[PDB]
Amino acid sequence: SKWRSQLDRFVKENQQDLAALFWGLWLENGDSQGTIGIDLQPTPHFVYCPKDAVEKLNNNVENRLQELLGIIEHNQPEIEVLMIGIGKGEIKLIQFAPEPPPPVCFEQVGKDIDGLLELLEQRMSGEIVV
Amino acid sequence: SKWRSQLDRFVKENQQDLAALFWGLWLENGDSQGTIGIDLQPTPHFVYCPKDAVEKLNNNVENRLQELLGIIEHNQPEIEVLMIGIGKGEIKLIQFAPEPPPPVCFEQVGKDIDGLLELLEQRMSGEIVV
């Protein structure tokens, strides 16, 4: 269960870059691909999670995050970032309203999603271990 | 308006305590008093912002955050901390899903809301200035 607090600390230290990536992917995909996931195995990597898979997977003892589907539906990508981390099937909800908001974060980092994916995934490696 | 970034730094570094206070206030008051606000003057201090008051104050040119009212109505306090910082009439949304969730932060920090309020308020003093 320690990976949860490792993921928590990583998010805390990387909110602006995660917001830039969140917003960049929002621009390209909106919600058509589902929810941005961080699958932690075999090493942490960004994925998309269709709403079915989230419900299927929140339908599990270790999870059962109350109203998760509504939280995912009601997230406002212009002001707040939402992702889900996944370690051996258990969800940790990632949600934060950064400063500046995600679209400004995107403009201020000045990186495309490919650049942010590689930078963030390198940073995760060996920092979050399941 | 540097206070927006100082408040962002404060929240990032104090998620557990703010989560414990948020849930302690939920235990005490539920939604009977409105939304938890942080009034930044003369010193940052926690207040309650009734629904009508939030709305009137969001009805101002520096604010007009899209879907603010809906974010407030949909907040899931077992999962999500929600507060609004208020600096010279400027709203800043605070929303984040802590690790562990808010009711566990309250249990783990082992203090009542009076203790939490005093600690968090002294901490913010000097650190977030308008």
mmCIF file of C-alpha atoms in Angstrom:
data_model
loop_
_atom_site.group_PDB
_atom_site.id
_atom_site.type_symbol
_atom_site.label_atom_id
_atom_site.label_comp_id
_atom_site.label_asym_id
_atom_site.label_seq_id
_atom_site.Cartn_x
_atom_site.Cartn_y
_atom_site.Cartn_z
ATOM 1 C CA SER A 1 0.000 0.000 0.000
ATOM 2 C CA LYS A 2 3.062 2.252 0.303
ATOM 3 C CA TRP A 3 2.863 3.127 -3.421
ATOM 4 C CA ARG A 4 -0.161 5.325 -2.605
ATOM 5 C CA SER A 5 1.895 7.747 -0.515
ATOM 6 C CA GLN A 6 4.739 7.636 -3.061
ATOM 7 C CA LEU A 7 2.238 8.555 -5.783
ATOM 8 C CA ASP A 8 0.754 11.260 -3.527
ATOM 9 C CA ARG A 9 4.173 12.833 -3.003
ATOM 10 C CA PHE A 10 5.055 12.622 -6.692
ATOM 11 C CA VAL A 11 1.835 14.431 -7.617
ATOM 12 C CA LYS A 12 2.477 17.108 -4.976
ATOM 13 C CA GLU A 13 5.938 17.803 -6.403
ATOM 14 C CA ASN A 14 4.844 17.742 -10.073
ATOM 15 C CA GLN A 15 1.448 19.453 -10.183
ATOM 16 C CA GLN A 16 2.309 21.974 -12.897
ATOM 17 C CA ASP A 17 3.717 19.402 -15.321
ATOM 18 C CA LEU A 18 0.872 16.976 -14.610
ATOM 19 C CA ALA A 19 -1.564 19.869 -15.226
ATOM 20 C CA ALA A 20 0.125 20.742 -18.525
ATOM 21 C CA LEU A 21 -0.108 17.084 -19.581
ATOM 22 C CA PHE A 22 -3.694 16.783 -18.337
ATOM 23 C CA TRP A 23 -4.720 19.860 -20.362
ATOM 24 C CA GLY A 24 -2.768 18.929 -23.479
ATOM 25 C CA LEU A 25 -4.486 15.545 -23.535
ATOM 26 C CA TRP A 26 -7.828 17.237 -22.848
ATOM 27 C CA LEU A 27 -7.275 19.449 -25.916
ATOM 28 C CA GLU A 28 -6.592 16.433 -28.132
ATOM 29 C CA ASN A 29 -9.096 13.927 -26.731
ATOM 30 C CA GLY A 30 -11.530 15.584 -24.347
ATOM 31 C CA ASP A 31 -13.191 12.670 -22.526
ATOM 32 C CA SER A 32 -13.634 10.403 -25.574
ATOM 33 C CA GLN A 33 -10.859 8.029 -24.489
ATOM 34 C CA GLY A 34 -11.912 7.925 -20.845
ATOM 35 C CA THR A 35 -9.934 8.855 -17.763
ATOM 36 C CA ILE A 36 -6.188 9.435 -17.703
ATOM 37 C CA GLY A 37 -4.606 6.637 -15.711
ATOM 38 C CA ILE A 38 -1.188 6.055 -14.253
ATOM 39 C CA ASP A 39 -0.678 2.287 -14.484
ATOM 40 C CA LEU A 40 2.164 1.609 -12.097
ATOM 41 C CA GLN A 41 3.258 -1.803 -13.434
ATOM 42 C CA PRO A 42 5.677 -2.902 -14.746
ATOM 43 C CA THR A 43 6.838 0.719 -14.378
ATOM 44 C CA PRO A 44 4.597 3.775 -14.056
ATOM 45 C CA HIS A 45 3.137 4.790 -17.408
ATOM 46 C CA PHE A 46 0.222 6.909 -18.610
ATOM 47 C CA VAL A 47 -2.827 5.105 -20.018
ATOM 48 C CA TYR A 48 -6.451 5.891 -20.775
ATOM 49 C CA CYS A 49 -9.242 4.140 -18.842
ATOM 50 C CA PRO A 50 -12.669 3.945 -20.521
ATOM 51 C CA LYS A 51 -15.553 4.614 -18.160
ATOM 52 C CA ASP A 52 -16.548 0.921 -18.230
ATOM 53 C CA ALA A 53 -13.123 -0.202 -17.005
ATOM 54 C CA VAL A 54 -13.253 2.404 -14.220
ATOM 55 C CA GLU A 55 -16.671 1.197 -13.039
ATOM 56 C CA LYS A 56 -15.711 -2.467 -13.478
ATOM 57 C CA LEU A 57 -12.607 -1.742 -11.419
ATOM 58 C CA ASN A 58 -14.155 0.551 -8.795
ATOM 59 C CA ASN A 59 -16.518 -2.453 -8.379
ATOM 60 C CA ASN A 60 -13.898 -4.021 -6.106
ATOM 61 C CA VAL A 61 -13.446 -4.251 -2.354
ATOM 62 C CA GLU A 62 -10.139 -2.400 -2.136
ATOM 63 C CA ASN A 63 -11.731 0.434 -4.151
ATOM 64 C CA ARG A 64 -15.455 1.324 -4.027
ATOM 65 C CA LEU A 65 -14.658 5.059 -4.093
ATOM 66 C CA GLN A 66 -18.078 6.539 -3.368
ATOM 67 C CA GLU A 67 -19.506 8.405 -6.381
ATOM 68 C CA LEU A 68 -16.271 7.991 -8.370
ATOM 69 C CA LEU A 69 -18.162 8.044 -11.673
ATOM 70 C CA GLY A 70 -19.787 11.334 -10.707
ATOM 71 C CA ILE A 71 -16.485 12.809 -9.567
ATOM 72 C CA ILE A 72 -15.032 11.856 -12.983
ATOM 73 C CA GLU A 73 -18.060 13.281 -14.779
ATOM 74 C CA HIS A 74 -18.103 16.542 -12.811
ATOM 75 C CA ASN A 75 -14.373 17.348 -12.969
ATOM 76 C CA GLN A 76 -13.852 20.729 -14.672
ATOM 77 C CA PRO A 77 -10.664 20.359 -16.771
ATOM 78 C CA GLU A 78 -10.279 24.141 -17.145
ATOM 79 C CA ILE A 79 -9.637 24.507 -13.373
ATOM 80 C CA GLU A 80 -8.807 21.054 -11.992
ATOM 81 C CA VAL A 81 -6.775 17.957 -12.927
ATOM 82 C CA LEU A 82 -8.125 14.456 -12.475
ATOM 83 C CA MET A 83 -6.281 11.184 -13.050
ATOM 84 C CA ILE A 84 -6.402 7.695 -11.493
ATOM 85 C CA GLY A 85 -3.347 5.779 -10.320
ATOM 86 C CA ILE A 86 -3.651 1.977 -10.517
ATOM 87 C CA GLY A 87 -1.471 -0.459 -8.572
ATOM 88 C CA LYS A 88 -2.429 -4.158 -8.821
ATOM 89 C CA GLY A 89 -6.044 -3.195 -9.367
ATOM 90 C CA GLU A 90 -6.520 -0.620 -6.579
ATOM 91 C CA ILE A 91 -7.419 2.986 -7.523
ATOM 92 C CA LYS A 92 -5.960 6.109 -5.985
ATOM 93 C CA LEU A 93 -7.858 9.164 -7.163
ATOM 94 C CA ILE A 94 -5.630 12.031 -8.288
ATOM 95 C CA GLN A 95 -7.429 15.371 -8.176
ATOM 96 C CA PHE A 96 -6.149 18.883 -7.635
ATOM 97 C CA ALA A 97 -7.013 22.428 -8.741
ATOM 98 C CA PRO A 98 -3.567 23.891 -9.474
ATOM 99 C CA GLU A 99 -2.238 27.431 -9.671
ATOM 100 C CA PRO A 100 -2.194 28.553 -12.445
ATOM 101 C CA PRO A 101 -5.125 26.554 -13.845
ATOM 102 C CA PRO A 102 -4.313 23.655 -16.213
ATOM 103 C CA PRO A 103 -4.666 25.638 -19.482
ATOM 104 C CA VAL A 104 -2.187 28.240 -18.204
ATOM 105 C CA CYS A 105 0.082 25.463 -16.921
ATOM 106 C CA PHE A 106 -0.015 24.086 -20.465
ATOM 107 C CA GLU A 107 0.887 27.450 -21.961
ATOM 108 C CA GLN A 108 3.640 28.081 -19.351
ATOM 109 C CA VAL A 109 5.432 24.725 -19.563
ATOM 110 C CA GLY A 110 5.367 25.069 -23.338
ATOM 111 C CA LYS A 111 5.745 21.318 -24.003
ATOM 112 C CA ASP A 112 3.667 18.990 -26.190
ATOM 113 C CA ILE A 113 2.097 15.879 -24.681
ATOM 114 C CA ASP A 114 4.863 13.665 -26.115
ATOM 115 C CA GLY A 115 7.479 15.740 -24.287
ATOM 116 C CA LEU A 116 5.535 15.726 -21.030
ATOM 117 C CA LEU A 117 4.765 11.989 -21.195
ATOM 118 C CA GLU A 118 8.456 11.118 -21.497
ATOM 119 C CA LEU A 119 9.597 13.646 -18.882
ATOM 120 C CA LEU A 120 6.985 12.594 -16.309
ATOM 121 C CA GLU A 121 7.407 8.842 -16.936
ATOM 122 C CA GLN A 122 11.169 9.111 -16.439
ATOM 123 C CA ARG A 123 10.550 10.981 -13.167
ATOM 124 C CA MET A 124 8.101 8.302 -11.915
ATOM 125 C CA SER A 125 10.556 5.471 -12.623
ATOM 126 C CA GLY A 126 11.807 3.907 -9.410
ATOM 127 C CA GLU A 127 10.006 6.636 -7.405
ATOM 128 C CA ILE A 128 6.661 4.790 -7.238
ATOM 129 C CA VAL A 129 7.080 1.031 -6.793
ATOM 130 C CA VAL A 130 4.244 -1.368 -6.171
ATOM 131 C CA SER B 1 -1.832 38.817 -6.496
ATOM 132 C CA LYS B 2 1.089 36.667 -5.308
ATOM 133 C CA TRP B 3 -1.232 35.282 -2.618
ATOM 134 C CA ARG B 4 -2.702 32.821 -5.116
ATOM 135 C CA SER B 5 0.678 31.134 -5.459
ATOM 136 C CA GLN B 6 1.465 31.363 -1.761
ATOM 137 C CA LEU B 7 -1.871 29.695 -0.984
ATOM 138 C CA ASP B 8 -1.116 27.038 -3.582
ATOM 139 C CA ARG B 9 2.215 26.311 -1.855
ATOM 140 C CA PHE B 10 0.533 26.252 1.537
ATOM 141 C CA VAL B 11 -2.106 23.737 0.441
ATOM 142 C CA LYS B 12 0.421 21.400 -1.254
ATOM 143 C CA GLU B 13 2.506 21.233 1.910
ATOM 144 C CA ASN B 14 -0.446 20.882 4.302
ATOM 145 C CA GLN B 15 -2.881 18.534 2.573
ATOM 146 C CA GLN B 16 -3.260 16.137 5.528
ATOM 147 C CA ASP B 17 -4.017 18.869 8.081
ATOM 148 C CA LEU B 18 -6.370 20.730 5.742
ATOM 149 C CA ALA B 19 -8.076 17.429 4.963
ATOM 150 C CA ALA B 20 -8.409 16.668 8.684
ATOM 151 C CA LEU B 21 -9.898 20.111 9.336
ATOM 152 C CA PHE B 22 -12.207 19.850 6.323
ATOM 153 C CA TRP B 23 -13.623 16.549 7.547
ATOM 154 C CA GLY B 24 -13.735 17.676 11.183
ATOM 155 C CA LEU B 25 -15.833 20.647 10.065
ATOM 156 C CA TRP B 26 -17.980 18.290 7.984
ATOM 157 C CA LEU B 27 -18.521 16.191 11.123
ATOM 158 C CA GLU B 28 -19.491 19.288 13.093
ATOM 159 C CA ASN B 29 -21.591 21.145 10.542
ATOM 160 C CA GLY B 30 -22.220 19.097 7.402
ATOM 161 C CA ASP B 31 -23.549 21.503 4.804
ATOM 162 C CA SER B 32 -25.554 23.575 7.293
ATOM 163 C CA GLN B 33 -23.270 26.654 7.077
ATOM 164 C CA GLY B 34 -22.225 26.608 3.431
ATOM 165 C CA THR B 35 -18.737 26.340 1.978
ATOM 166 C CA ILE B 36 -15.500 26.521 3.965
ATOM 167 C CA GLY B 37 -13.684 29.720 3.015
ATOM 168 C CA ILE B 38 -10.259 31.039 3.882
ATOM 169 C CA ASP B 39 -10.546 34.780 4.359
ATOM 170 C CA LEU B 40 -7.022 36.030 3.847
ATOM 171 C CA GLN B 41 -7.251 39.324 5.733
ATOM 172 C CA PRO B 42 -6.261 40.562 8.209
ATOM 173 C CA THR B 43 -4.635 37.132 8.667
ATOM 174 C CA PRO B 44 -5.835 33.991 6.866
ATOM 175 C CA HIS B 45 -8.679 32.492 8.816
ATOM 176 C CA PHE B 46 -11.401 29.956 8.163
ATOM 177 C CA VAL B 47 -14.958 31.137 7.606
ATOM 178 C CA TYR B 48 -18.221 29.723 6.314
ATOM 179 C CA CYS B 49 -19.603 31.063 3.037
ATOM 180 C CA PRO B 50 -23.349 30.457 2.669
ATOM 181 C CA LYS B 51 -24.604 29.405 -0.742
ATOM 182 C CA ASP B 52 -26.189 32.765 -1.529
ATOM 183 C CA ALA B 53 -23.025 34.584 -0.432
ATOM 184 C CA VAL B 54 -20.743 32.454 -2.627
ATOM 185 C CA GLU B 55 -23.048 33.123 -5.577
ATOM 186 C CA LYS B 56 -23.170 36.896 -5.119
ATOM 187 C CA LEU B 57 -19.406 36.970 -4.664
ATOM 188 C CA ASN B 58 -18.789 34.792 -7.726
ATOM 189 C CA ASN B 59 -21.018 37.327 -9.554
ATOM 190 C CA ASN B 60 -18.024 39.665 -9.648
ATOM 191 C CA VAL B 61 -15.739 40.557 -12.516
ATOM 192 C CA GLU B 62 -12.570 39.160 -10.952
ATOM 193 C CA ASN B 63 -14.328 35.818 -10.333
ATOM 194 C CA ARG B 64 -17.085 34.194 -12.479
ATOM 195 C CA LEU B 65 -15.479 30.765 -12.141
ATOM 196 C CA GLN B 66 -17.339 28.489 -14.519
ATOM 197 C CA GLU B 67 -19.444 25.886 -12.741
ATOM 198 C CA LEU B 68 -18.251 26.959 -9.288
ATOM 199 C CA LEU B 69 -21.695 26.309 -7.828
ATOM 200 C CA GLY B 70 -21.859 22.879 -9.424
ATOM 201 C CA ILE B 71 -18.390 21.917 -8.189
ATOM 202 C CA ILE B 72 -19.609 22.839 -4.697
ATOM 203 C CA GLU B 73 -22.854 20.840 -4.967
ATOM 204 C CA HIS B 74 -21.085 17.783 -6.384
ATOM 205 C CA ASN B 75 -18.190 17.704 -3.889
ATOM 206 C CA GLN B 76 -17.866 14.289 -2.223
ATOM 207 C CA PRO B 77 -16.431 15.131 1.220
ATOM 208 C CA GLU B 78 -15.489 11.517 1.961
ATOM 209 C CA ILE B 79 -13.072 11.820 -0.972
ATOM 210 C CA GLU B 80 -12.519 15.488 -1.834
ATOM 211 C CA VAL B 81 -11.494 18.544 0.171
ATOM 212 C CA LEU B 82 -13.193 21.736 -1.084
ATOM 213 C CA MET B 83 -12.478 25.236 0.212
ATOM 214 C CA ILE B 84 -12.365 28.713 -1.352
ATOM 215 C CA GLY B 85 -9.581 31.145 -0.636
ATOM 216 C CA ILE B 86 -10.783 34.752 -0.730
ATOM 217 C CA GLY B 87 -8.218 37.507 -1.252
ATOM 218 C CA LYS B 88 -9.568 41.060 -1.577
ATOM 219 C CA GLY B 89 -12.808 39.658 -2.999
ATOM 220 C CA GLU B 90 -10.945 37.325 -5.399
ATOM 221 C CA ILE B 91 -12.048 33.629 -5.224
ATOM 222 C CA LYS B 92 -9.540 30.804 -5.590
ATOM 223 C CA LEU B 93 -10.831 27.230 -5.733
ATOM 224 C CA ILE B 94 -9.152 24.716 -3.421
ATOM 225 C CA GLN B 95 -10.124 21.131 -4.334
ATOM 226 C CA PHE B 96 -7.990 18.019 -3.937
ATOM 227 C CA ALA B 97 -8.365 14.350 -3.159
ATOM 228 C CA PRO B 98 -5.895 13.717 -0.304
ATOM 229 C CA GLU B 99 -4.103 10.502 0.590
ATOM 230 C CA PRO B 100 -5.481 8.982 2.880
ATOM 231 C CA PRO B 101 -9.043 10.322 2.262
ATOM 232 C CA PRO B 102 -10.342 13.136 4.536
ATOM 233 C CA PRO B 103 -12.033 11.021 7.246
ATOM 234 C CA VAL B 104 -8.802 9.038 7.739
ATOM 235 C CA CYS B 105 -6.735 12.226 7.880
ATOM 236 C CA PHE B 106 -9.076 13.386 10.641
ATOM 237 C CA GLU B 107 -8.626 10.097 12.502
ATOM 238 C CA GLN B 108 -4.864 10.048 12.028
ATOM 239 C CA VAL B 109 -4.108 13.619 13.094
ATOM 240 C CA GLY B 110 -5.757 12.931 16.461
ATOM 241 C CA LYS B 111 -6.980 16.472 17.234
ATOM 242 C CA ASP B 112 -10.323 18.251 17.386
ATOM 243 C CA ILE B 113 -11.287 21.116 15.068
ATOM 244 C CA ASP B 114 -10.384 23.768 17.643
ATOM 245 C CA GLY B 115 -6.833 22.438 17.762
ATOM 246 C CA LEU B 116 -6.644 22.111 13.988
ATOM 247 C CA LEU B 117 -8.041 25.555 13.298
ATOM 248 C CA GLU B 118 -5.514 27.241 15.594
ATOM 249 C CA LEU B 119 -2.548 25.354 14.125
ATOM 250 C CA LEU B 120 -3.479 25.904 10.488
ATOM 251 C CA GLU B 121 -4.328 29.570 11.070
ATOM 252 C CA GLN B 122 -1.019 30.364 12.800
ATOM 253 C CA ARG B 123 0.826 28.473 10.029
ATOM 254 C CA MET B 124 -0.768 30.564 7.298
ATOM 255 C CA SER B 125 0.054 33.805 9.116
ATOM 256 C CA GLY B 126 2.957 35.503 7.398
ATOM 257 C CA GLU B 127 3.059 32.779 4.752
ATOM 258 C CA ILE B 128 0.042 34.012 2.746
ATOM 259 C CA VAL B 129 -0.193 37.816 2.565
ATOM 260 C CA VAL B 130 -2.437 39.986 0.373
#
